[PDB]
């Protein structure tokens, strides 16, 4: 849905550089790191 779009614009607005060259590399890095199982397991470590 709009799910990726709001996430992508938020990643462009919060944590990103200028000159449009490092920008897409940074958003690819952060968007990759958001969806790894390892940190996801660290982040839902409250209910167990």
């Amino acid at each position: 849905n709009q799910s990726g779009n709001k996430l992508f614009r938020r990643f462009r607005k919060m944590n990103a550089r200028q000159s449009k060259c490092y920008e897409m590399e940074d958003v690819l890095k952060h968007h990759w790191l958001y969806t790894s199982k390892y940190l996801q397991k660290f982040m839902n470590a409250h209910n167990a």
């Binding site: 779009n5 992508f8 607005k13 060259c21 897409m24 940190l39």
Partner: protein, 160 residues
Amino acid sequence: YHKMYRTVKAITGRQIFQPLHALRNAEKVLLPGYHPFEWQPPLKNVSSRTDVGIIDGLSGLASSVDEYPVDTIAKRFRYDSALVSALMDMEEDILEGMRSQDLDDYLNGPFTVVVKESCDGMGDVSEKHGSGPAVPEKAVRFSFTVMRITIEHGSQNVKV
């Protein structure tokens, strides 16, 4: 983050959080393009380096003015790097599944993996405030997704 870290260090005295050095170190550990691996076929038309991550998606598209002009910025990984990194951080999950479904850790493969793929455009991604509506700049991510890892041993297989 650095402000928060230095304030908690100043208040607590002992250090609990971390500065950015070890953060970026563990980041490039977790990033693709870091761990070694191999292929039993030689993989024609594929490079042999195990240590390349982010590259241009253009794959050497010469965008000189004498040729067909584009402006679309494209960043990409290498595919096998993404596969091996996804495997290495689902390694604990598949270890626990192997310990759960009545097996040992010293098993060999060949583990059969089912991978779907997807890409979709997202419409506008732009916040133009200099004069208002400049361009409906449309962007698109292309992605993969693992959904099933199995191993066949003896007679049958098992969804590990």
